Design a protein around this nucleic acid. Structure first.
Ligand SMILES: [Zn+2]
Ligand SMILES: [Zn+2]
Lengths: 104, 245, 87, 112, 51
RNA sequence: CCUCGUCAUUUAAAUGGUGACGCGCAUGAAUGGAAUGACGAGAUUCCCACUGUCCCUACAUGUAGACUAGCGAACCCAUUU
RNA sequence: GAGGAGGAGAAGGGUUUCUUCUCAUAAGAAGAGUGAGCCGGGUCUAAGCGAGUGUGUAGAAGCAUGAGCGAAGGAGAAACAGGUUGAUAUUCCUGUGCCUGUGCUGUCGUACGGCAACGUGUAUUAGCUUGUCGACACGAACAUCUAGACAAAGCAGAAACACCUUUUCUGUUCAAGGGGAAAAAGACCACUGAGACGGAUCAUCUGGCGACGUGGUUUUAUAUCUGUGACCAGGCCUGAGCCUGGUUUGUUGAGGAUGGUCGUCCAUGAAAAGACAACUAUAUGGCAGCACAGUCCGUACCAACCGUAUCAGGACUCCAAGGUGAAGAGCCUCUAGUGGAUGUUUUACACAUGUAAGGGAAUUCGGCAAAAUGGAUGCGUAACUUCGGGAGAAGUAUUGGUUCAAUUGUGAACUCAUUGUGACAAGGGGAAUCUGACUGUUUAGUAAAAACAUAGCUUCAUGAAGAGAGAUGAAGUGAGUUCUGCCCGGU
RNA sequence: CCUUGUUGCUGUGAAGGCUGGCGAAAGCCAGCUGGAGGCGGCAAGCCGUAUUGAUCUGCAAAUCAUUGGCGUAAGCAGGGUA
């Protein structure tokens, strides 16, 4: 079985130095570089990952279409559907108590 | 001879580092506030947990650190200064709190930010209010009684993390982790096991001190080792304390 | 469970360290690992994150507590005194 | 601020003053180019890849070399690569926008 | 090795041009009295201290 | 110290080992005293197995060594021995 | 012998690399050789250092604040195949691309859908504020993918043939970019309304703060296709060009990658540059073609490094085939790489090793050295103990080849001239005493210990803090069990 | 002190869990599941007990052979800083 050399950079096996083995049209087995995985947004209240948005690294994320980075609601990314339902209710119910305390 | 271990470890390059610190711990300065508890966190060198608070100063949001009392939670609203209610975790002027109550983080003079009771499991007791002089007597966890003016502030509860000294550290590595952030030498080599160039207890054909271990308060610094200015020694019973409020 | 007569959770240590010391450690070690009841949601899902900080695995609430138990003896008493002050 | 500058790539440092009289033509096309190189190594590059090779002044850069060629010899340039050699000479390689013209310019200039 | 600074490279370039014998025509000149160039070096016998 | 202390056991035979005894030249209590478990490349005595350690030495193998080509030093030295 | 005497990088060296000539040879002389927007430096900040200014000094040192600096292995926009030289190549040549900006010409835009979970639409600058990304310990088990390795069939070429053999060997390829599933694992939305009870994992567990069920919404790989043909094998001719193949299935599987769980801690495991969303104003903005731009420095070679040298020493990392076996152990082979002071059968004494009648420690300060035991399976296991251990205690038996049953428990028969963990690999065991509790540490170069450390125990001083008595420092004894008597005359 | 790299094969089988039996209770006994430990035998490595072996004009101003101790961790190591 054919064995590999490091084509570029350092041999020292840090997080930035992941590699995989690949077979070429010329029938050689060579190392090729790998980019790191990305984490997408977590909710600002509960720590849950937001639905409807992609996971990518900051530079690659910025080059995608805007639709990959939001949902069409009051808080776009930012917060999940349950947390917005709570926020909408809370603001309403507080105003009604103040209404009563003003009228009485 | 040469300089002893006790002096070398007091030089500046040996002082504790602050790079992992969260901030300076202490009360806000304002006459009244409403605060929210944002997070409860561990800080690398300290066994009692800290609470991050958020309060408005002018229009702007500002952040502070308190030591956590037991029974707060993330999201709780707390009331600071004059006109706060007697509820667990509020901060109040000392003259408002009834006798026999338990308090933490007491200011020694107004607006100092809180000193006194700050270690896990500790509290102070309010023992007397004097309506003429506007003084209050507090009993500290050493047993000492001290007088503070009624305008000083204090936190209502016991400091979190009590009970920690119940579980013995059975192994050498467990002690290692505890002393890694402190200033004391660990492991500690005994002075009688050194040569006379290194320590006043060194040398001789048997391991012994050879001279009395009780030393004067006014002795020169590079030989002030042993029991410094001891009033008595040994395992026998002492005498009655004298007490005034 | 409970395959040993006396040694309990301290069986991990074999014949090392003293007998008397192990039976003090045991009290704390059994207390640390248990799940406890949540005040906010009623479920038995509370566990320790770090000394002094306790946390619920369902609803996410964090609360200050003791080193090896969520509520200490001094707290159970003092909490009552405050409720009387409010009267 | 003063520092030993041992890791730096540019050996100059100081900003330069004005002067009462200034040198006539300045750093200019006929200071930039030294000579074209014609040997068995260079000949292949003219015949196969439409590129000439030249020695250039140490103070020169890619933009300056591009201008100077279009001024002295007259053909239009696609690319310039540069190489500092072990013998203390900066070499430049110039590829022309049309091949074939390389053999015309080389022969007129007497390089080949 | 392959990685070098600009300052180290110029030291090597200069150390390499100086390392040459007396040219063979000079020996014929009436006034010339040198036998061998005593400043010649070998990589096996001395260090440059370019570091 | 006297000292290879006296009595018992282990051997054919014990300046050794273990068990007893005690006016202990000069034992002894966090200058820490006493009785055990688990763990020591720690110090010491005995038994079983095992053997060229020994009685008592013999034969055989590889590599150097002797002789031969090429290459080729040093310590030391009043020297007549 | 793939934890290589193989193929490559870093630190260190500096032309030792390639061609020609000459011996002068680990020797010289003369030439030639290192090409980048996408690889690394120049950027950000760690622990930390610091010009100037203030205070101080005869001048200094020191102390307060602080521009600038601080990682070729931490963070950090964008490239891959195939060819070419005597010597360079993700840098040159051909092909297909991508990032950041600039300009021309066309062509469209100023909004909607779903009960909802959310979708359709490549969208401008600017600003508050709130949040996210960058951005993170160790250990264990379980899934899924990819390299790799096997076995059948097909074809092409090889090896072997006194005999036998469809026996044996080598091949059967597909990059970045573009398009794209089923699957598995989790979140969530609508209807529904469940218990002394249902659901679910290898393991924990889970439900009126909404179970099972029936329909959906979304996040995370990979296979497959295109990449316009290159590349490989074979045949025919040849100082050149033609022709034919590159087809199918099963088993296994990382020392690489990823996912959601679980455990541990008086230990809770970096920052910043640079980004993004929501909200508010404001709008000539999106896409396709064509064109232009992207500076400066490093790039050869190492078996050539440090030890006065062509020195059995020292010296940071990466990739890794088949058999035997639990096993990148030892032993044997494939790919790739390798070697000289000459002849002589060569006494004695040596240094590395073999074997030995009868006896079995008589040897010696002393069993020092050697021998003996050895893997797996079963039977059987004492005193004492802190009840965990002692414990593989001790003591005993079995083991190869073949042909069968039975399906993980294993049985049975036949066979051999010394018997079978056959080579290689692979514990000697028991009874007592002194001593230190244990794992750990030490006199680099004559001492590894009973010495040091350690957990635990006791005493002392303080309300001063960027620290606040469950704290901060100073001493002594040495885990646990059981005890710790008397004396304040001297110092 | 800051930033990093480096755990392969096997034995024993704590806490927690599920079944079956015994008991008036409290809680006892089997078999299985689970995988803790400055815990055992080894590999790569790190070290330095014995032969008072070889060498002592050395291969070497501290090396070599066999034999040993630890090896899931108060373990070993590169660079930056004090
Ligand atoms: Zn949320
Ligand atoms: Zn809860």
């Amino acid at each position: 079985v054919e064995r590999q050399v490091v084509r570029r950079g350092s041999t020292f096996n840090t997080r930035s130095n992941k590699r995989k083995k690949v077979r070429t049209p010329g029938n050689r087995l060579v190392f090729q570089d790998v980019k790191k995985k990305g984490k997408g947004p977590k909710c600002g209240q509960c720590g849950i990952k937001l639905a409807g948005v992609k996971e990518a690294r900051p530079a690659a994320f910025s080059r995608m279409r805007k639709s990959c980075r939001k949902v069409n609601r009051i808080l776009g990314g930012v917060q999940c559907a349950k947390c917005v339902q709570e926020k909408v209710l809370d603001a309403f119910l507080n105003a009604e108590e103040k209404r009563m305390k003003e009228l009485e | 001879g040469k300089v002893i271990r006790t002096l070398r470890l007091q030089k500046e390059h040996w002082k504790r580092k602050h790079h992992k610190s969260k901030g300076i711990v202490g009360f806000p300065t304002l006459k009244n506030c409403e605060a929210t508890v944002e997070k409860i966190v561990h800080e690398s060198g300290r066994p009692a947990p800290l609470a991050i608070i958020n309060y408005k100063k002018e229009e702007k949001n500002t952040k502070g650190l308190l030591v956590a009392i037991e029974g707060i939670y993330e999201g709780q609203k707390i009331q600071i200064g004059e006109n706060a209610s007697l509820e667990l975790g509020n901060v109040c002027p000392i003259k408002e709190i009834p006798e026999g109550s338990l308090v933490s983080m007491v200011e020694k003079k107004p607006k100092d930010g809180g000193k006194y009771v700050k270690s896990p499991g500790c509290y102070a007791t309010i023992v007397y209010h004097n309506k003429l002089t506007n003084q209050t007597t507090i009993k500290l966890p050493s047993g000492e009684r001290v007088r503070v003016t009624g305008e000083s502030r204090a936190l209502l509860g016991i400091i979190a993390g009590g009970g920690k000294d119940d579980k013995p550290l059975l192994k050498a590595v467990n002690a290692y982790y505890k002393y890694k952030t402190k200033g004391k030498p660990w492991p500690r080599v005994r002075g009688v096991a050194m040569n006379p160039v290194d320590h006043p207890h060194g040398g001789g054909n048997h391991q012994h001190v050879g001279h009395p271990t009780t030393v004067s308060r006014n002795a020169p610094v590079n030989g002030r080792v042993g029991l410094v200015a001891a009033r008595r020694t040994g395992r026998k019973k002492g005498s009655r304390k004298i007490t005034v409020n | 469970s409970r395959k040993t007569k006396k040694v309990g959770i301290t069986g991990k240590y074999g014949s090392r360290y003293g007998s008397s010391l192990k039976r003090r450690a045991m009290i704390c070690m059994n207390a640390q690992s248990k799940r406890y009841c949540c005040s906010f949601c009623g479920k038995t899902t509370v566990k320790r994150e770090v000394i002094g900080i306790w946390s619920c695995r369902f609803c996410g609430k964090k609360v200050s507590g003791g080193a090896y138990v969520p509520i200490t003896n001094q707290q159970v008493e003092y909490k009552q005194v405050i409720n009387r002050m409010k009267m | 601020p003063k520092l030993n500058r041992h890791k730096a790539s540019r050996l100059d440092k100081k900003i330069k003053q004005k002067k009462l009289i200034e040198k006539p033509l300045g750093f200019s096309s006929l200071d930039i180019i030294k000579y074209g190189i014609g040997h068995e190594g260079a000949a292949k590059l003219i015949e196969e890849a439409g590129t000439l090779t030249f020695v250039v002044d140490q103070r020169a850069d890619k933009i300056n070399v591009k201008k100077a060629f279009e001024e002295i010899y007259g053909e239009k340039v696609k690319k310039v690569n540069i190489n500092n050699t072990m013998k203390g000479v900066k070499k430049a390689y110039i590829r022309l926008v049309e091949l074939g013209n390389a053999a015309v310019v080389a022969t007129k200039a007497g390089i080949l | 090795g392959s990685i070098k600074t600009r300052r180290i490279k110029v030291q090597l370039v200069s150390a390499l041009k100086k390392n040459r014998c007396i040219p063979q025509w000079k020996r014929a000149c009436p006034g010339f009295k040198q036998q061998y160039n005593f400043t010649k070096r070998s990589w096996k016998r001395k260090t440059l201290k370019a570091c």
